[PDB]
Write a protein that binds this ligand. Sequence first.
Ligand code: FDE
Length: 184
Amino acid sequence: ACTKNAIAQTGFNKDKYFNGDVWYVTDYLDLEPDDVPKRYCAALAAGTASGKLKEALYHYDPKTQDTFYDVSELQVESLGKYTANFKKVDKNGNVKVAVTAGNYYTFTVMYADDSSALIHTCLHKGNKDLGDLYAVLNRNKDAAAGDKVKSAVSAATLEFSKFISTKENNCAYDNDSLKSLLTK
Ligand code: FDE
């Protein structure tokens, strides 16, 4: 179940966030913690491709090796808050599972600057969801969370100390496939 109406950053700069580059998840918190493994790797590219707002996603479970990519088309609900379809694709953009009405996530950018961000998502796959999931992002896959984003976690009435880090999982990312997937 999702329970939070996440508030988007005041004065969110959409063109900077959606610049075509990659964001790495460095830390995450699910309010239903059993919905996601204790060890995980994830990243995303976000950009406009031929006028369309897009996100490409990568998930990797470093223990099981479960791997998947997704291409997402975002619709705007308000500045910094989106609803996103998703099609599961291979790294080259070939469709494995097509878009369908029932498969979507909400996505809210709660804080962003040029190098870090805090987002919330609520994933739906039919009648199931993956709970409220918060993620701290960085442009540098190895960056420890700095004061701006940690303060934003506190401003959302969360505690950064409770977030689970991805840094000890030997995560390795295909940045090229995330960037190319934006077009697919
Ligand atoms: C730790 C983590 C982190 C993250 C992040 C993220 C972001 C930022 C966004 C997202 C989204 C998503 N996811 Fe996410 N994520 C996670 C997790 C996860 C998991 C475990 C999964 C699976 C579920 C199932 O159902 O199986 C996912 C999942 C997911 C999805 C689905 C895909 C397919 O195709 O199926 C999506 C769309 N994710 N995501």
